[PDB]
Amino acid sequence: NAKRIEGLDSNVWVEFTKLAADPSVVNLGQGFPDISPPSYVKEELSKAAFIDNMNQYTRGFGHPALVKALSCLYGKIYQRQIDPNEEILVAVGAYGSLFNSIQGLVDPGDEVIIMVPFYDCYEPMVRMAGAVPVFIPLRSKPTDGMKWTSSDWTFDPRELESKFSSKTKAIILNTPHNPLGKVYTRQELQVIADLCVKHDTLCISDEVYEWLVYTGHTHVKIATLPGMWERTITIGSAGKTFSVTGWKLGWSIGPAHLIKHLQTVQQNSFYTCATPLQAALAEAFWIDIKRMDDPECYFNSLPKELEVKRDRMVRLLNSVGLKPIVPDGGYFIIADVSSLGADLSDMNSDEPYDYKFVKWMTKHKKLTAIPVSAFCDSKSKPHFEKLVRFCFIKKDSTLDAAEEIFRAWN
- Known binding positions for substrate: 31, 178, 389
Q: Which amino acid is at 320?
A: V
Sheet with strand 323-325: strands edge to edge:
323-325, 332-336, 387-391, 370-371
374/121 Cα distance (integer angstroms):
11
CA–centroid distance for 152 within its chain: 19
Which partner in a copy of itself, Ca ion, none is near 29 (CB below 5 to 8 A by kind)? none
Q: Is 281 in the site for a copy of itself (CB under 8 A)?
A: no
Annotated binding site: 31, 178, 389
DSSP type of residue 133: E
Provide CB contacts within 8 A for 359, sequence distance 6+. 19, 347
In the complex, what is the shortest distance from the CB of residue 226 to a copy of itself, in angstroms, rounded to a whole number? 25
Q: Is 190 in the site for a copy of itself (CB under 8 A)?
A: no
Is residue 103 a contact partner of residue 119, using CB atoms and an 8 Å limit?
A: no
Is residue 220 a contact partner of residue 185, using CB atoms and an 8 Å limit?
A: yes
Q: Is 247 in the site for a copy of itself (CB under 8 A)?
A: yes
Binding-residue total with a copy of itself (CB under 8 A) = 69
Among 25-33, 70-78, 142-150, 195-203, the segment contacting a copy of itself (CB under 8 A): 25-33
Which partner in a copy of itself, Ca ion, none is near 36 (CB below 5 to 8 A by kind)? a copy of itself
* Alpha helices (H) in 61-207, listed in sequence order: 64-78, 93-105, 122-128, 157-163, 186-199
**Contact map string, positions 128 to 167, toward Ca ion, x by CB under 5 A:** --------------------------------------x-
In the complex, what is the shortest distance from the CB of residue 139 to a copy of itself, in angstroms, rounded to a whole number? 29
- Cα dihedral sign, 397-25-402-238: negative
94/237 Cα distance (integer angstroms):
5
Among 73-81, 282-290, 331-339, 396-404, the segment contacting Ca ion (CB under 5 A): 73-81
Task: Select the residue interacting with Ca ion from 15, 34, 156, 200 (CB under 5 A).
Answer: 200
Task: Select the residue interacting with a copy of itself from 22, 32, 147, 161 (CB under 8 A).
Answer: 32
173/250 Cα distance (integer angstroms):
17
Decide whether 166 or 345 has the Cβ nearer to Ca ion: 166
351/372 Cα distance (integer angstroms):
13
Is residue 284 a contact partner of residue 70, using CB atoms and an 8 Å limit?
A: no
Contacting positions for a copy of itself (CB under 8 A): 1-5, 8-9, 11, 30-34, 36-37, 41-43, 45-46, 49-50, 52, 54-58, 60, 91-93, 95-96, 99, 103-108, 121, 124-125, 128-129, 239, 244-249, 260-261, 263-265, 267-277
Binding site for Ca ion (CB under 5 A): 81, 166, 199-200
